[PDB]
Design a binder for this molecule. Structure first.
Ligand SMILES: [Mn+2]
Ligand SMILES: [Mn+2]
Lengths: 293, 7
């Protein structure tokens, strides 16, 4: 029914055009991407259990030409495996092309391309922070609501070769075992505080050692001891997360037991940060590829 | 500092 290969060709056609140049797909092609990827999301576990080699990327926030640059450096799928940590939309000027490209690769390569839920993949957040407005401007509100139904099915966490725990935000004082994540039911919005809310929203903090208050107005901060306890309980080496704007594109927290990834250089046009992607090779060795502001 | 929901 849906021509995946022609959607991707048209999305990749603007490689080497002036940044900001739109790919105006048909509404029914976009609806097709949302409904087909949703079925793929629902057939795969909510806790992904992935294997290296793998490229891990943090927030994109609709910077579509920076996503194209990440693929240039890392190899366009299926040349590399990918895990994205969420926050595909809002802030940037081309959320639509960004999420369409990622959803198209997910349909095309469903065992080699993976996407986590971020906090901007929630209707209440992407309504305010740009994605509703981009949808209204370029298509309509009904298509914005179709994306909502797709985002509600996204998986929440990943474990890479039994050693790297990946999610968007971070930890929860409610999180006792991995099984707790596993029967969070989908589709779900995030209607209350608690585990799923914390996985999308929580932040490390150097000046709390346990659990602390979060300046975002939601969820918590966690310190180095929290991370240490969690990794040792579940026999893990590293938390890989995203969610926070960092100067170098990547930043270590909690005695290098956590790393933050941010894959959108020069965020909002206003911060002068770099972007970063984490390459985990086949022998569980990590390296960082930097994308300049 | 772009507005805490987030520099
Ligand atoms: Mn986030
Ligand atoms: Mn973000």
């Amino acid at each position: 029914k849906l021509n995946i290969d022609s959607i991707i060709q048209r999305l990749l056609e603007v490689r080497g055009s002036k940044p900001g140049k739109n790919v105006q797909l048909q509404e029914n092609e976009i609806r097709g991407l949302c409904l087909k990827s949703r079925e793929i999301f629902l057939s795969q576990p909510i806790l992904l259990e992935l294997e290296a080699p793998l490229k891990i990327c943090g927030d994109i926030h609709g910077q579509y030409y920076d996503l194209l640059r990440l693929f240039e450096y890392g190899g366009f799928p299926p040349e590399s495996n990918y895990l994205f940590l969420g926050d595909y939309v809002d802030r940037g000027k081309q959320s639509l092309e960004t999420i369409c490209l990622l959803l198209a690769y997910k349909i095309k390569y469903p065992e080699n391309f993976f996407l986590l839920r971020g906090n901007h993949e929630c209707a209440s957040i992407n309504r305010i922070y740009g994605f509703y407005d981009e949808c209204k401007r370029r298509y309509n509100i009904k298509l914005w609501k179709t994306f909502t139904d797709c985002f509600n099915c996204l998986p929440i966490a990943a474990i890479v070769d039994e050693k790297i725990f990946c999610c968007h935000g971070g930890l929860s004082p409610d999180l006792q075992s991995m099984e707790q994540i596993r029967r969070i039911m989908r589709p779900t919005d995030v209607p209350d505080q608690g585990l799923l809310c914390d996985l999308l929203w929580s932040d490390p903090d150097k000046d709390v050692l346990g659990w602390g208050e979060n300046d975002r107005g939601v969820s918590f901060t966690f310190g180095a001891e929290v991370v240490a306890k969690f990794l040792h309980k579940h026999d893990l080496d590293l938390i890989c997360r995203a969610h926070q704007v960092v100067e170098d594109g990547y930043e270590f927290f909690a005695k290098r037991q956590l790393v933050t990834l941010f894959s959108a250089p020069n965020y909002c046009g206003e911060f002068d940060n770099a972007g970063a992607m984490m390459s985990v090779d086949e022998t569980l060795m990590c390296s960082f590829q930097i994308l300049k502001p | 500092x772009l507005x805490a929901x987030x520099a």
